[PDB]
Write a protein that binds this DNA or RNA. Structure first.
Ligand SMILES: [Mg+2]
Ligand SMILES: [Mg+2]
Ligand SMILES: [Mg+2]
Ligand SMILES: [Mg+2]
Ligand SMILES: [Mg+2]
Ligand SMILES: [Mg+2]
Ligand SMILES: [Mg+2]
Ligand SMILES: [Mg+2]
Ligand SMILES: [Mg+2]
Ligand SMILES: [Mg+2]
Ligand SMILES: [Mg+2]
Ligand SMILES: [Mg+2]
Ligand SMILES: [Mg+2]
Ligand SMILES: [Mg+2]
Ligand SMILES: [Mg+2]
Ligand SMILES: [Mg+2]
Ligand SMILES: [Mg+2]
Ligand SMILES: [Mg+2]
Ligand SMILES: [Mg+2]
Ligand SMILES: [Mg+2]
Ligand SMILES: [Mg+2]
Ligand SMILES: [Mg+2]
Ligand SMILES: [Mg+2]
Ligand SMILES: [Mg+2]
Ligand SMILES: [Mg+2]
Lengths: 148, 51, 99, 193
RNA sequence: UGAAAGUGUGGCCUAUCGAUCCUUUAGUCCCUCGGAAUUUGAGGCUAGAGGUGCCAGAAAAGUUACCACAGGGAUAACUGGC
RNA sequence: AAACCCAUACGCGUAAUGAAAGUGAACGUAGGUUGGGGCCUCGCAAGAGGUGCACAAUCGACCGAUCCUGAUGUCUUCGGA
RNA sequence: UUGACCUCAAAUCAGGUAGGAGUACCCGCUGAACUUAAGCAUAUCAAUAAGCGGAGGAAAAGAAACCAACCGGGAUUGCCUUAGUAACGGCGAGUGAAGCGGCAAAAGCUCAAAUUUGAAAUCUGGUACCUUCGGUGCCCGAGUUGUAAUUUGGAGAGGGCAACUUUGGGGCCGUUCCUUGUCUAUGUUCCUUGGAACAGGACGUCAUAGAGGGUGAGAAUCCCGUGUGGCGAGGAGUGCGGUUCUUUGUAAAGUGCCUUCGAAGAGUCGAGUUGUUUGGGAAUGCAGCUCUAAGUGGGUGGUAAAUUCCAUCUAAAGCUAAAUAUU
């Protein structure tokens, strides 16, 4: 608020902290991003390399729902099972009763293998997966059955 | 279009309300507000639901 | 149009038993009718042809159908419209040879 | 104007924006007005539930097709199967949508069961007499909530057949990619003599 | 190239040159044209060329003695001072 | 216009990298070396040894892109270990 | 010669209607520059101000020639978000939407194109009467160059078979809404100060009323009021709640099966060019000119073109509340 501001402290002092020589003025270097290829070039090159120019290929009418592919790493993959039955399924490491994990209903589109699920069988329903993730799942004893 | 109302996190609101309730059962803090509870036998002061 | 069961490929998607809903009558909108064929056939007799149709008849007799389609794409707007109109003109030519 | 290391800001305030600033002080009062309007409408339709029965329907856009959702109307085939006409249903509290079509038997039969439940749960007073007071509720949506279908179970056996399910996606992608080339090659093969 | 060791990634050394955007060429014959395909076309990736000599790179003729404004003793036309 | 309560979504974040198609983070006690507060053991103490978070330097490993190599195989041109 | 028709006229003809004001918000046309770009011409300011026309309590939009590419959604509007994103841009400065999703609010429909043809069945006006926001009878007239019924694509129509089901309008008394009136508690007791007690102190009362104002100084208890309920008056009204009279109706509507049909908007769509505009990019919309269609057709499917498919709608005609805006 207003009373913890240095404006209250500058009262009495002539320049309000802006100097006597420099003389706070309206817009001495320009408005906005003026001078990027000119008198503000060193800044734009030191702190914003890549700002000028166009790189790649255009996409007309891009919808950000074709590219909806949220990723789940294996390291979690039991958070999708509630705490009530997680210990049950973890101690009863058995086929014929393996837990099913619909990652799509949880809101994930792809499964990835970051690290170290246990050696429990698990059925993982996923639209997409990775090579290493599926390797680890079926090495633990489970299976990835694909869906849409 | 000045900012008039302030967001406070729900859990901070509830933290503060719980603290203010707990401070009700402290005669040192109730006297310090000037509430005249010197002759009150003990607090939290509970009366019947007949009220 | 049966789906596979996966998320990429040709017929990607979930398998759901289908229903094939009833055909909407607003899909036969441009369908020809007997009344309408009669009316149009009659009007073409009494109104005759237009200058560019006469030009097409001549170009089809003499210079072939390719330049006819070029001219019809210019006089009309589209290649498919030009094709349909040149076919109309060929039918007209055959019928006028019969008459 | 460009200065020390800071993000490039795109603040769009180079028009006369101060002439167009709507501050919603009216939030609370407008809520009060909505509640009063719902109350007045309910009193005016005093037995009726203030909302039409809407169907359960599947959302588009593969991001969202995992979720089922409330729709607009009950798909003339659906109501005909429920055993009543669209005109009568519109007078009975059933939204009808003439422009959506049934391509999915699960959604179709789910909505038909929805309609049967509604018809069994409502009482329709005759046009003649009594008006047998009937204790309105204010929501048909709360009485018939949209339930997400259970697609699978919580536990099953493991059936692994050795297809690897990454090569599966790979090969589907590849055959999509190289379908047309192979069709062209087959055409050029067939047109050999 | 030399028998070879070795030398050679332009001129014995110190000068002899050039961003974005655009165009154009070469390469991979690779990616995209987003309802699905084929062929043209177009757009992309990588390396160069077309040039900005005010050479970190605006697209640019004069006059005002009819003149104007913001300013300058950072700067002339007097004295004064060295 | 306060205060109190709430569903479903949505936003940021939990995964990056490539123009893109797209692929997508453990050889190992989640590595080694050097140093490292604090703790532990012996020691009266001095000090010696063990473990060593954070942080710093460095050599490695893993994911993506680029440039290669190009197995089992095969719609013989796909696949890409 | 007489009497029509057509087209055009005159009447201080009988009846009506438009203008102007206001203009915050709304629908449109027209349309800058200062400014930013550290200069400036595209750009930006801005599809803004000023100018012009036109409405209402909201207007507009609106029941898809939509979005999509999904296991598909389903009029319009508005909010949260999508998103400072895709895209435009001396690719500089800067600009910059939309689909999905969550919510508020929800409501649907009607004409043209069909032979009533065993009966213009339709309608304005004048006049007599009546129960007058109108009705009945009569009389001129409009109208066959098409007024009613019937149908609007979701369908639907013409025949044939078979059974069932459901209905209209007035009055009265209430309720709903609007406006308005009136009635509905408790100290002005005592002492001091003071010009005045509404101040201070003592004793009390009411309180679903200690909001506020007034009164010779800070008054719940002096006055008006406040609070709680009650008793009325006048209207609008078809929203429903009961009662009463008319029986509408040899009528209308709905539903099943077979069969024959199934009309669907043109100087428009679309194309070329020009200009303007848009985020719209080989051209987003708009307009001008030129050319100018079709009916298993046409539009759309955000890279121009040819070929083959698929999906989705159904333009060139029209009405419609609410959520929304309001200096
Ligand atoms: Mg300062
Ligand atoms: Mg100063
Ligand atoms: Mg300065
Ligand atoms: Mg200075
Ligand atoms: Mg060498
Ligand atoms: Mg050299
Ligand atoms: Mg160069
Ligand atoms: Mg280029
Ligand atoms: Mg220079
Ligand atoms: Mg000049
Ligand atoms: Mg001069
Ligand atoms: Mg001069
Ligand atoms: Mg000087
Ligand atoms: Mg290390
Ligand atoms: Mg400027
Ligand atoms: Mg300036
Ligand atoms: Mg200037
Ligand atoms: Mg104006
Ligand atoms: Mg309107
Ligand atoms: Mg309208
Ligand atoms: Mg964001
Ligand atoms: Mg703009
Ligand atoms: Mg143009
Ligand atoms: Mg203009
Ligand atoms: Mg244009």
């Amino acid at each position: 608020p207003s009373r913890f501001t240095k404006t209250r402290k500058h009262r009495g002092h002539v320049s309000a902290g802006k100097g006597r020589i420099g003389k706070h003025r309206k817009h001495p270097g320009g408005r906005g991003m003026a001078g990027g290829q000119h008198h503000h070039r060193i800044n734009m090159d030191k702190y914003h390399p890549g700002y000028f120019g166009k790189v790649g290929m255009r996409y007309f009418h891009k919808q950000q729902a074709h590219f909806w592919k949220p990723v789940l790493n294996l390291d979690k993959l039991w958070t999708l099972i509630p705490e009530d039955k997680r210990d049950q399924y973890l101690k009863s490491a058995s086929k014929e009763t393996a837990p099913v994990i619909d990652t799509l209903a949880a809101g994930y589109g792809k499964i990835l293998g970051k690290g170290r699920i246990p050696n429990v069988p698990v059925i993982v329903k996923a639209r997409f997966v990775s090579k290493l993730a599926e390797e680890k799942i079926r090495a633990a004893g489970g299976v990835v059955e694909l869906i849409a | 279009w000045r900012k008039w109302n302030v967001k406070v996190n729900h859990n901070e609101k509830r933290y503060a309300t719980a603290s203010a309730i707990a401070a009700t059962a402290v005669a040192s803090l109730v006297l310090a507000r000037g509430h005249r509870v010197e002759k009150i036998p003990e607090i939290p002061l509970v009366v019947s639901t007949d009220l | 149009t049966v789906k596979t069961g996966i998320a990429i490929g040709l017929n990607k998607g979930k398998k759901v038993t289908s229903m094939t809903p009833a055909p909407k009558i607003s899909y036969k909108k441009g369908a020809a009718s007997n009344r309408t064929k009669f009316v149009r056939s009659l009007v073409r007799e009494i109104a005759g042809l237009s200058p560019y149709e006469r030009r097409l008849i001549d170009l089809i007799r003499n210079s072939g159908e390719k330049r006819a389609r070029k001219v019809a794409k210019k006089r009309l707007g589209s290649f498919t419209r030009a094709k349909a109109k040149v076919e109309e003109m060929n039918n007209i030519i055959a019928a006028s040879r019969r008459h | 104007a460009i200065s020390k290391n800071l993000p490039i800001l795109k603040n769009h305030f180079r028009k006369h924006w101060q002439e167009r600033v709507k501050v919603h002080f009216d939030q609370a009062g407008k809520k009060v007005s909505r509640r009063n309007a719902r109350a007045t409408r309910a009193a005016k339709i005093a037995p009726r539930p203030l909302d039409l029965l809407r169907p359960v329907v599947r959302a588009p856009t593969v991001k969202y097709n995992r979720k089922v959702r409330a729709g607009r109307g009950f798909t003339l085939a659906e109501v005909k199967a429920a055993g009543l006409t669209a005109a009568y249903a519109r007078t009975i509290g059933i939204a009808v949508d003439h422009r959506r079509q049934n391509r999915n038997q699960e959604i179709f039969d789910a909505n038909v069961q929805r309609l049967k439940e509604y018809q069994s749960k409502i009482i329709v007073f005759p046009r003649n007499g009594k008006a047998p007071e009937a204790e309105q509720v204010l929501s048909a949506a709360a009485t018939f909530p949209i339930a997400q279908p259970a697609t699978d179970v919580e536990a099953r056996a493991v059936q692994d057949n050795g297809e690897s399910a990454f090569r599966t996606l790979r090969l589907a992608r590849s055959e999509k990619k190289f379908r047309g080339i192979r069709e062209k090659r087959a055409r050029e093969k067939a047109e050999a003599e």
